[PDB]
Symmetry: C3
Subunit: 180 residues, 3 copies
């Protein structure tokens, strides 16, 4: 261990990529929406749970703008800018496509707190449109994620539900000062 | 060898910059752009007058630098910031993306100014553009229907040759090929965005 | 100095972080609003340097109202905007603005001398909502010019820019300061 170990480790961090998965669920209590012609603006904010569905982490918040309608695909293209809030852990910001009829990949434009300085991509997977979504972030350039955010991930499916305690925001099942 | 070479190549990639030029053309076939006259300042006739807060969603076509291949589209929004009686100098703040079909997309954020070249932030990308950062130079050829961009992208692997063809010098007479306009299979990106 | 020095220097730049502080002030001469869920709020205010001796440019972008907090007597906004520093370039941000508390936004990148940057911006509210203080933590760019690194005036309601800066005197502006 020494000079070249130091430099190597620095480079390792700069290039390293970590996975982080979360569920976004519209529980229809925040008055968050749930057209066909370019122009419609859709502000939104849903709840965010961890990959294991045992912890309420926070919320999403941002806007979608309708771009185009696809007849044969039966859906619409939106361009979106929004953030994922994880309480005191910090937040992650994204920019890119949200399309009603398919999964997409968004740009991770950066983050705060433990996500400070991150960059990469977020894979958006639609389980039930539009109320149940699953995301996997691929984050480059940050330190090791805390174990509470890396619990075994429940495979996305229609049956996948947050725990009762997570839904009730029980103190054992929330992130520190979880965003609401 | 290995160790110092491996480290070097890793750093080279993190630091390396590649240029990419494309043409953005509004062919007036997408209902774009739309005016959302939210500023709502009326003039003397009974018409629209630009004011802070007017929102402009938009989506244009994207062709490669050689103008021989249809790549995809832009999609996003502009917000009116400042304006006056002069054609030149109206300022918008914009957030939008460039879609390159299966290659991925690039997102940008920054200034759009009528009749002025500007530079925007490349906030990142996906696919072959995953993890990139840098800037995009915006040049208006024919305001507001024909634009030209050169991206300076840091942090990603060598761009494929199809996206690095000899660039047609940007001028008002620069036009996509007939093949590209009609989206002929030999003149489009894989699953080009539409 | 040599090969390992060259590489180390490159890494140092890619990982290095620099602080940059500015003041944002709504002088009410740009038509920009002073503050219903979903409402959209476009805005543009003036930007001064940390020493308050130099007019740098403006902010420009939008805020979207997300929620009300009855308890805390405030609202949450999600914002996307840029800071313009004249010929120096600009910095773009994305993140939360909350009327009753400080927040941290993402620095999505920059242009000019800020090209290739990333990091975070700490938003401090001095006077609601017309006077704010920011500290940028910028990673990956070369040394900031001294004119942007003058001694920072501690933020307080009393903090005011110099009359030279207010009047955009050549001695107290960024080159081609944004307006």
């Amino acid at each position: 261990g020494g000079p070249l170990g130091s430099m190597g480790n620095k480079v390792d961090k700069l290039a390293g990529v970590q996975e982080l998965s979360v569920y976004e669920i519209n529980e229809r209590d925040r008055g968050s929406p749930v057209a066909n012609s370019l122009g419609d603006l859709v502000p939104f904010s849903n709840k965010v749970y961890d990959g294991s569905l045992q912890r309420r982490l926070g919320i999403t918040a941002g806007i979608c703008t309708l771009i185009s309608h696809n007849a044969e695909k039966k859906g619409d293209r939106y361009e979106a800018q929004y953030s994922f809030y994880f309480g005191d852990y910090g937040h992650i910001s994204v920019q890119g496509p949200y399309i009603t009829y398919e999964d997409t990949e968004l740009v991770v434009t950066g983050g705060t707190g433990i996500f400070a300085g991150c960059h990469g991509v977020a894979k958006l997977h639609q389980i039930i449109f539009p109320v149940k979504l699953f995301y996997t972030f691929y984050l480059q350039g940050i330190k090791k994620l805390p174990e509470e955010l890396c619990a075994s991930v429940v495979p996305p499916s229609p049956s996948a539900e947050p725990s009762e305690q997570a839904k009730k925001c029980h103190p054992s099942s929330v992130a520190p000062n979880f965003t609401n």
